[PDB]
């Protein structure tokens, strides 16, 4: 029974941890600062794995201490232990505490624990039922710190339906709760609900709806970093689909910056894929170092080959990469953006042709770009010249392209503009860092002269004046 | 009691705004007074000054110096003294009365 | 797309969706074109002809393959696709000449016949006077218009002074 | 003028004696001895007769001020 | 051998001598300063990750 | 009398728009940047030393030894002021004194 | 004749690392001679942890009898060293204690027990009184780092060795540290610093535990032709007495150097192919054999275009002994990369050289490196806020 | 922390045998797929009949 | 059965959020102001502090009963001085460097200890440091 002994030994400490978290929530209510709730949810993912049927049962039947309809709701949905030898009655509430109903903060937290275990137990329908009851509970209430808990509930409330694969009945609830949070100035709940709505819209390729939603809604500035990352990723995906590549790239870079530094590997992989695709679409080049990471190497290998093909500026290589990894790109939800990369491949090839050749025959250009005919190369090069891709001219009668003589870059305003952007960013960094310096509320003006020691000087100086002058 | 609480909260908000405006003004003028105090502390360096030798830095603001009168003193250092110049065996100018490193 | 769970897959659905995509291309609402294209599954985009034709036309238009854009009229997936094609074509010519002015410094009169996809030489004259192209005595259209450079002759001293003043603000106004 | 300006706060805030030990508390530790005197006098005028514990706690260290 | 700055046009058989400008010491010093300050940022990285 | 005394050290309007010599300005910029090179090289060592240094030596060990951070700040401030002022003055002069 | 006896102790034997790298290569995995030499070294030194690592990484069949015999020998020797240390700590003095720990650490390093060797070397360093003995321990750590290409170990021990050499004015140890640092800079593609250090120690080389003097001179030439300007290459390498004396016994390396210097570009290209095949098999130059060669090619092209206003494509192809199409592709690739200051008129097949100002090339690097430092600053602030 | 278990973490399946473990100024040109310069020079030496 | 009770609650919470934000910002601003004001006050008191006479530097011969110490002022021979209430008599070891007040000569600080006489002697003797590694044969 070594396994039983060990399992019970972790079950008791997990029960103690849940007790510590419920005490943190209750003292957050008592002290009226909702931020104490965060450290309860800070350990939430760790506890989500550190619980089982016995832990849930012990917690729900010693934690309520009142057999209301709640205990008639979640007890039947979980298994019960036998007459265990160590019948340690886990009753944190005694006397008036047991009689008094639980705070709305903590019943929701235990119900979240039950929902999480149901998800880990694949009881998606039962999890949906429990989450529906929980949503009624937290929609009825109007507390302030509960919102900090409430957002998390919503993230799981949608998550259970993610395994139900409906995501449509949840849209109305998400919109209603988003409105009720926005009207209440609930920053955390509004951010979580906006992220959930964006994810729901993108699950069905409703990019127009998500674009409208992000156009009219205002994301909370004082939101969590883990919610800022999701919002930036979703907005970047919207911008990428809507051909707004520059803002898409900026948002994806910001999301990668705000991603967790050690965890959330899959989020990193998805954002890296989309960022690589957008950067190739923008005409820039993806950073090589991101392909060197141990976690990202296998995921980005098809994207590494795609980046290689695009950098070579060869139509045939890009088409080979497409015909080789089209199914993988489709499974990753980036095939539509990959298709647009043909124009960028042609643009890059034309750019290197102009950068390398002073005068180059149109047939040679078509051969180097693996196009069909030099007649098509004529139109392609003309479009590139008109768009400003390359500074050149075409001699139709002669049949070649003459690239313009390179102008002295440092004698123009472009270095000034680049330096301007970098200087403004550096000054912004300095101002942000200065504004982030916090002085602890020390007892100021106590490092000054002390009263007794200052009086010492007055008396000694009085003696000095009374004795030296006489 | 709802209206009383709401009106009290409104008055508290307006009072907080007044307090923040006053604090910003006081910072603006306190910078000027800091500059004035820095300027006026330089009267301790008025001549005549004795010449000593910086022997050791006991702490941030006090030091042992050997005056040319022949006596070693544990005195204070003027806060506006560049501590990068307080090398060993460095000649310093001390207040003629208090021997303070000025 | 909404009631497709109970509704069966319409035979004409893909054709009409491709018609919508081609119409979006005709009105230069390419941003809406890609958003509506993303609504389709990724398979029929590269497989179904009714969807393959408009997306390929968009690729040709963006990359500059205007000859393929004109050839797209011949191989349309359906007769209903015809009308929107003409709506696109009127743009293409005015786009093609836009390249010719900025790329070709001088082109022969007949040389543009395949470039501008004009059947009758008379159709050149009216389009040229609409475009205001100065025909040359040697049947050469002189497109000397690059003299209107980015105008580096002028220093944007006002903008530069504003930027430097903003630097001074960010260095001093912080307090 | 500064001392009188700080003094005048008591005549304005005496109807709400609890506010004076908050607006003036920081003035009571300022560099200017006249402003400190005005802070003390504002506490006296506004919280007169009330026996405010906060104002008395503010005044208690001020009785050991270096300035007479 | 960089003994003088110029090129040789074989087609016309003419030596073209160029009045090259000296390298900008300011840019060289700025580049090495950037490198050293990157090292400083690495030291700050170690200090930050170790103490937080 | 206060307004009359305010004219003390009041710089003339001519030197407000006067541009510093560009040869000397470039030489000063190069010299100060070359100084910050060594200052940053020492700044790295200063950071590493202060990593392992007891709190009693935070100021005592700074006595008699130059502080790379302070000199770096001073050089940065000097170069920012000089270059920004020169650029702004040149940009103003390009508008004010124009031939057209 | 006493050359190799001058060098530092050969622990770890870097030849073992080279042979392991050779076996890692797909081309030479099945080479019977390389496997035989590596197994002979393992058997002679009784490298049980290294045998385990070899059979795990390379998927070999572990000889149970050989492994058991080598493990028994290792256990008996470790027991003997532990007994010696126990006797030293009770009867003999601190010097004998340090000698016993040095023997234990040397044995742990010799058998490939990397982590145990590092722990024992740290313990020995903690109570080693002699500065030179401490610096020898630091060199042992540097050799261990080079054996496994441990960048952190190499950097930390290089800084420590620099400090120790500064404390005690040991110029011999300074030259050895220069050789080790040049080897590391070769390993990390820092050919400028590697060339500088190798040229500084070309006349003071005594690190025979790292490489043979001929191999050291070949490496010095290889890094010099890629990191040195033409006047510097002439003064230091072309006219270097020691380098020329060594090259008298290395006709291939002398041909490779002088073909570039004397502008025999076809001979230089053939020697570059030979050199490339040499770099591919060297564990130090393997990651950079693609880079180095490419750079050399650029150098050759640049040299041929440095003195001429314009050159026909046929002339370039004839000079390099290659086709016109090859020259076209190579020149286009290198111009697109911004490494060659010329443009190709393919209509007339004429390469016309350019003279871009150093200001542009400084500004581009300023943008690049400032962006790198700015990214570091941004990510550091990101770490700081949370 | 609120780790992103919502997004499907694609399996690593990577090589933990120190695949690269290097610190250079690495650039994309080293990753260009091509045969070695020795092979190219060998294949073009005989293209001229030599 | 509530009227504008929900309206009152909405207004109250809307004001409460702004009140909390402004209170936190005011606390930060007050911390900044208090720091700068403390700097100003310390600067003004430093002018008066620097005019206070400096302390003599003496060497401790031996501690005695009743918190007395026998010191040797640098040029001025020996004194029997009191000990400040903030200085422990057990920390006043012989041959220690101490600071004595200007008038009372009261021992009010234990300065960092001087150079050890053995260290001073061996500095002038200056034998070359050596180890077994630099001895041959």
Swiss-Prot record, chain E:
Expression induction: By FOXO4; expression in embryonic stem cells (ESCs) is mediated by FOXO4.
Source domain of life: Eukaryota
Localization terms from the record: Nucleus; Cytoplasm, Cytosol
Post-translational modification remark: Phosphorylated by AMPK.
Expression across tissues: Highly expressed in embryonic stem cells (ESCs). Expression decreases as ESCs differentiate.
Family, as annotated: Belongs to the proteasome subunit S9 family.
Function statement: Component of the 26S proteasome, a multiprotein complex involved in the ATP-dependent degradation of ubiquitinated proteins. This complex plays a key role in the maintenance of protein homeostasis by removing misfolded or damaged proteins, which could impair cellular functions, and by removing proteins whose functions are no longer required. Therefore, the proteasome participates in numerous cellular processes, including cell cycle progression, apoptosis, or DNA damage repair. In the complex, PSMD11 is required for proteasome assembly.
Subunit structure: Component of the 19S proteasome regulatory particle complex. The 26S proteasome consists of a 20S core particle (CP) and two 19S regulatory subunits (RP). The regulatory particle is made of a lid composed of 9 subunits including PSMD11, a base containing 6 ATPases and few additional components.
Protein name stated in the entry: 26S proteasome non-ATPase regulatory subunit 11
Positions spanned in the full protein: 371 to 422 of 422
Curated annotation (Swiss-Prot), chain F:
Keywords: DNA damage, DNA repair, Hydrolase, Metal-binding, Metalloprotease, Phosphoprotein, Protease, Proteasome, Ubl conjugation pathway, Zinc
Residues with the Phosphothreonine modification: 54
Keyword Transferase annotated: no
A GO-annotated cellular component: nucleus
Signal sequence segment: none
Tissues showing expression: Widely expressed. Highest levels in heart and skeletal muscle.
A Gene Ontology BP annotation from the UniProt entry: regulation of proteasomal protein catabolic process
Modified residues (Phosphoserine): 12
Molecular function, one GO term: K63-linked deubiquitinase activity
Role noted for this protein: Component of the 26S proteasome, a multiprotein complex involved in the ATP-dependent degradation of ubiquitinated proteins. This complex plays a key role in the maintenance of protein homeostasis by removing misfolded or damaged proteins, which could impair cellular functions, and by removing proteins whose functions are no longer required. Therefore, the proteasome participates in numerous cellular processes, including cell cycle progression, apoptosis, or DNA damage repair.
Family: Belongs to the peptidase M67A family. PSMD14 subfamily.
Subunit text: Component of the 19S proteasome regulatory particle complex. The 26S proteasome consists of a 20S core particle (CP) and two 19S regulatory subunits (RP). The regulatory particle is made of a lid composed of 9 subunits including PSMD4, a base containing 6 ATPases and few additional components. Within the complex, PSMD4 interacts with subunit PSMD7 through their respective MPN domain. Interacts with TXNL1.
Gene that specifies this protein: PSMD14
From Swiss-Prot, chain H:
Entry's Gene Ontology cellular component terms: cytosol; integrator complex; nucleoplasm; proteasome complex; proteasome regulatory particle, lid subcomplex; protein-containing complex
Subcellular localization: Nucleus
Keywords, in A-Z order: Nucleus, Proteasome
Biological process terms in GO annotation: double-strand break repair via homologous recombination; mRNA export from nucleus; proteasome assembly; proteasome-mediated ubiquitin-dependent protein catabolic process
Tissue: Expressed in limb bud, craniofacial primordia and skin.
Family to which this protein belongs: Belongs to the DSS1/SEM1 family.
Quaternary structure (record): Component of the 19S proteasome regulatory particle complex. The 26S proteasome consists of a 20S core particle (CP) and two 19S regulatory subunits (RP). The regulatory particle is made of a lid composed of 9 subunits including SEM1, a base containing 6 ATPases and few additional components. Belongs to the TREX-2 complex (transcription and export complex 2), composed of at least ENY2, GANP, PCID2, SEM1, and either centrin CETN2 or CETN3. Component of the homologous recombination repair (HR) complex composed of ERCC5/XPG, BRCA2, PALB2, DSS1 and RAD51. Interacts with the C-terminal of BRCA2.
Name listed for the protein in its UniProt record: 26S proteasome complex subunit SEM1
Curated annotation (Swiss-Prot), chain I:
Alphabetical UniProt keywords: Acetylation, ATP-binding, Cytoplasm, Nucleotide-binding, Nucleus, Phosphoprotein, Proteasome
Gene Ontology biological process terms in this record: negative regulation of DNA-templated transcription; negative regulation of programmed cell death; positive regulation of DNA-templated transcription; positive regulation of inclusion body assembly; positive regulation of proteasomal protein catabolic process; proteasome-mediated ubiquitin-dependent protein catabolic process; regulation of transcription by RNA polymerase II
Keyword Zinc: no
Gene Ontology terms: cellular component: blood microparticle; cytoplasm; cytoplasmic vesicle; cytosol; cytosolic proteasome complex; extracellular exosome; inclusion body; membrane
Subcellular location per the Swiss-Prot or TrEMBL entry: Cytoplasm; Nucleus
Signal sequence, start to end: none
UniProt keyword annotation of Ribosomal protein present: no
Modified residues (Phosphoserine): 104
Outcome (variant: residue 44 to Q): In a colorectal cancer sample; somatic mutation
Domain of life according to the entry: Eukaryota
One of the record's GO molecular function terms: DNA-binding transcription factor binding
Similarity-based family: Belongs to the AAA ATPase family.
Function: Component of the 26S proteasome, a multiprotein complex involved in the ATP-dependent degradation of ubiquitinated proteins. This complex plays a key role in the maintenance of protein homeostasis by removing misfolded or damaged proteins, which could impair cellular functions, and by removing proteins whose functions are no longer required. Therefore, the proteasome participates in numerous cellular processes, including cell cycle progression, apoptosis, or DNA damage repair.
């Amino acid at each position: 029974a070594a396994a039983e002994h060990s399992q019970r030994e972790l079950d008791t400490v997990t029960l103690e941890d849940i007790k510590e978290h419920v005490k943190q929530l209750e003292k957050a209510v008592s002290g009226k600062e909702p931020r104490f709730v965060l450290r309860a949810l800070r350990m939430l993912p760790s506890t989500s794995r550190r619980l089982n049927h016995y832990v849930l049962y012990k917690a729900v039947q010693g934690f309520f201490t009142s057999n209301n309809a709640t205990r008639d709701f979640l007890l039947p949905f979980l298994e019960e232990p036998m007459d265990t030898e160590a019948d340690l009655q886990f009753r944190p509430r005694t006397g008036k505490a047991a009689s008094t109903p639980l705070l709305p903060e903590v019943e929701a937290y235990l119900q979240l624990l039950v929902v999480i275990f149901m998800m880990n137990s694949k009881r998606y329908k039962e999890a949906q039922k429990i989450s529906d009851d929980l949503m009624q509970k937290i929609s009825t209430q109007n507390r302030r710190a509960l919102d900090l808990v409430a957002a998390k509930c919503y993230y799981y409330h949608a998550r259970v339906y993610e395994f139900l694969d409906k995501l449509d009945v949840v849209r109305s609830f998400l919109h209603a709760r988003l409105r009720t949070a926005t009207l209440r100035h609930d920053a955390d709940g509004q951010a979580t609900l906006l992220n959930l709505l964006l994810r729901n819209y993108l699950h069905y390729s409703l990019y127009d709806q998500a674009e409208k939603l992000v156009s009219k809604s205002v994301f909370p500035e004082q939101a969590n970093n883990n919610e800022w990352a999701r919002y930036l990723y979703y907005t970047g995906r919207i911008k990428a689909i809507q051909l707004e590549y520059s803002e898409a790239r900026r948002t994806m870079t910001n999301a990668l910056r705000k991603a967790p530094q050690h965890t959330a590997v899959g989020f990193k992989q998805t954002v890296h894929k989309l960022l690589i695709v957008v950067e190739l679409l923008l005409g820039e080049i993806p950073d090589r170092l991101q392909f060197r990471q141990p976690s990202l190497k296998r995921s980005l290998m098809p994207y590494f080959l795609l980046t290689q093909a695009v950098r070579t500026g060869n139509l045939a290589k890009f088409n080979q990469v497409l015909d080789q990894f089209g199914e993988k790109f489709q499974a990753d939800g980036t095939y539509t953006l990959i298709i647009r990369l043909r124009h960028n491949v042609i643009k890059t090839g034309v750019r290197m042709i102009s950068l390398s050749y002073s005068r180059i025959s149109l047939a040679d250009i078509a051969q180097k770009l693996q196009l069909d005919s030099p007649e098509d190369a004529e139109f392609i090069v003309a479009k590139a010249i008109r768009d400003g891709v390359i500074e050149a001219s075409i001699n139709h009668e002669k049949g070649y392209v003459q690239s313009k003589e390179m102008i002295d870059i440092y004698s123009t305003r472009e270095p000034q503009l680049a330096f301007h952007q970098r200087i403004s960013f550096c000054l912004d960094i300095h101002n942000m860092s200065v504004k982030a310096m916090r002085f602890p509320p020390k007892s100021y003006n106590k490092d000054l002269e002390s009263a007794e020691e200052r009086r010492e000087r007055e008396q000694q100086d009085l003696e000095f004046a009374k004795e030296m002058a006489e | 009691d709802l209206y009383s609480r709401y009106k009290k909260l409104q008055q508290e908000l307006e009072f907080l705004e007044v307090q923040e405006e006053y604090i910003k003004d006081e910072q603006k003028n306190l910078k000027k007074e800091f500059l004035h105090a820095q300027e006026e502390v330089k009267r301790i360096q008025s001549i005549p000054l004795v010449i000593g030798q910086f022997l050791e830095a006991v702490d941030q603001n006090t030091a042992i110096v050997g005056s040319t009168t022949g006596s070693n003193y544990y005195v204070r250092i003027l806060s506006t003294i560049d501590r990068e110049l307080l090398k060993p065996n460095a000649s310093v100018a001390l207040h003629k009365h208090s021997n303070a490193l000025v | 797309f909404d009631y497709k769970e109970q509704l069966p897959e319409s035979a004409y659905m893909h054709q009409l969706l491709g018609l919508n995509l081609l119409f979006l291309l005709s009105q230069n609402r390419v941003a809406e074109f890609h958003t509506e294209l993303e609504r389709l599954p990724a398979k029929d985009i590269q497989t179904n002809v009714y969807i393959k034709h408009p997306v390929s036309l968009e690729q040709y238009l963006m990359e500059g393959s205007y000859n393929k854009v004109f050839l797209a009229k011949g191989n349309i997936p359906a007769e209903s696709y015809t009308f929107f094609i003409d709506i696109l074509l009127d743009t293409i010519r005015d786009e093609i000449a836009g390249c010719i002015e900025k790329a070709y410094e001088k082109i022969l009169f007949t040389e543009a016949t395949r470039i501008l996809f004009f059947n009758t030489p008379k159709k050149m004259t009216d389009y040229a006077k609409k475009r205001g192209w100065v025909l040359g005595p040697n049947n050469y259209y002189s497109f000397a218009s690059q003299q209107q450079k980015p105008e580096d002759t002028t220093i944007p001293s006002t903008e530069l002074a504003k930027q430097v003043i903003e630097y001074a603000r960010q260095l001093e106004m912080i307090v | 003028v500064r001392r009188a300006a700080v003094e005048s706060l008591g005549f304005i805030l005496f109807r709400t004696p609890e506010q004076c030990p908050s607006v003036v508390s920081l003035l009571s530790e300022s560099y200017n001895p006249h402003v400190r005197y005005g802070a003390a006098m504002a506490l006296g005028i506004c919280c007169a007769g009330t026996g405010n514990k906060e104002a008395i706690n503010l005044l208690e260290p001020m009785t050991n001020d270096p300035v007479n | 051998d960089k003994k003088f700055h110029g090129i040789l046009d074989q087609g016309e058989g003419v030596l073209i001598i160029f009045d090259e400008p000296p390298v900008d010491k300011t840019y060289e010093a700025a580049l090495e300063t950037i490198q050293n300050m990157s090292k400083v940022v690495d030291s700050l990285y170690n200090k930050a990750k170790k103490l937080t | 009398e206060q307004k009359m005394l305010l004219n003390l050290h009041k710089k003339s309007w001519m030197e407000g728009l006067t541009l510093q010599d560009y040869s000397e300005h470039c030489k000063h910029n190069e010299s100060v940047v070359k100084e910050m090179l060594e200052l940053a090289k020492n700044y790295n060592k200063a950071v590493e030393e202060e990593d392992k240094m007891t709190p009693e030596q935070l100021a005592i060990k700074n006595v008699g030894k130059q502080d790379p951070k302070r000199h770096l700040e001073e050089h940065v401030d000097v170069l920012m002021t000089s270059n920004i002022v020169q650029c702004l003055a040149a940009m103003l002069d390009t508008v004010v004194f124009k031939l057209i | 004749e006493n050359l190799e006896e001058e060098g530092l102790p050969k622990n770890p034997d870097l030849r073992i690392a080279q042979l392991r790298f050779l076996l890692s290569l797909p081309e030479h995995r099945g080479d019977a001679a390389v496997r035989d030499e590596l197994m002979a070294a393992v058997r002679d030194n009784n490298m049980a942890p290294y045998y385990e690592a070899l059979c795990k990484s390379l998927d070999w069949q572990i000889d149970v009898d050989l492994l058991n015999k080598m493990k028994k020998a290792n256990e008996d020797e470790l027991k003997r060293l532990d007994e010696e240390l126990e006797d030293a700590e009770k009867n003999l003095g601190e010097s004998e204690i340090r000698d016993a720990m040095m023997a234990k650490a040397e044995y742990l390093c010799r058998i490939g027990d990397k982590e145990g060797a590092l722990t024992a070397f740290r313990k020995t360093y903690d109570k080693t009184v002699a500065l030179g003995h401490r610096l020898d321990i630091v060199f042992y750590l540097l050799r261990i780092g080079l054996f496994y290409m441990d960048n952190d170990l190499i950097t930390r021990n290089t800084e420590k060795a620099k400090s120790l050499i500064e404390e005690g004015g040991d110029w011999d140890r300074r030259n050895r540290l220069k050789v080790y640092q040049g080897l590391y800079c070769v390993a990390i593609r820092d050919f400028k610093q590697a060339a500088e250090l190798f040229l500084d120690t070309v006349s003071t080389f005594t690190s025979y535990e790292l490489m043979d003097y001929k191999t050291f001179v070949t490496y010095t030439v290889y890094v010099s032709m890629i990191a040195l300007e033409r006047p510097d290459l002439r003064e230091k390498v072309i006219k270097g007495a020691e380098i020329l004396e060594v090259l008298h016994s290395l006709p291939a390396v002398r041909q490779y150097l002088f073909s570039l210097y004397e502008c025999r570009y076809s001979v230089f290209f053939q020697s570059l192919a030979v050199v490339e095949q040499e770099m591919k098999k060297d564990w130090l130059f393997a990651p950079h054999y693609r880079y180095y060669v490419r750079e050399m090619r650029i150098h050759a092209y640049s040299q041929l275009l440095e003195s001429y206003r314009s050159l026909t494509l046929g002339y370039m192809a004839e000079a390099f002994g290659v086709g016109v199409e090859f020259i076209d592709q190579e020149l286009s690739r290198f111009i697109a990369a911004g490494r060659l200051h010329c443009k190709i008129d393919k209509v007339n097949e004429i390469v016309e050289t350019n003279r871009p100002d150093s200001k542009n090339w400084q500004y581009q690097e300023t943008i690049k490196k400032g962006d790198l430092l700015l990214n570091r600053v941004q990510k550091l602030s990101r770490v700081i806020n949370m | 922390d609120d780790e992103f278990e919502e997004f499907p973490a694609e399996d690593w399946a990577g090589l933990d045998e120190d695949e690269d473990a290097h610190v250079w100024e690495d650039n994309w040109d080293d990753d260009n797929v091509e045969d070695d310069f020795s092979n190219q020079l060998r294949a073009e030496l005989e293209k001229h009949g030599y | 059965g509530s009227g504008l009770r929900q309206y009152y609650l909405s207004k109250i919470e809307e004001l409460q959020l702004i009140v909390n934000d402004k209170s936190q910002n005011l606390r930060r601003l007050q911390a900044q102001r208090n720091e700068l004001n403390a700097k100003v006050r310390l600067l003004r008191e430093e002018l008066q502090l620097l005019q206070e006479q400096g302390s003599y530097v003496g060497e401790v011969v031996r501690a005695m009963d009743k918190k007395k110490v026998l010191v040797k002022v640098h040029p001025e021979g020996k004194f029997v001085v009191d000990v400040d209430k903030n200085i422990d008599i057990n920390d006043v070891t012989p041959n220690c460097r101490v600071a004595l007040r200007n008038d009372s000569y009261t021992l009010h600080k234990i300065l960092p200890n001087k150079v050890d006489p053995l260290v001073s002697l061996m500095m002038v003797e200056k034998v070359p440091d050596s180890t077994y590694e630099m001895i041959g044969g």
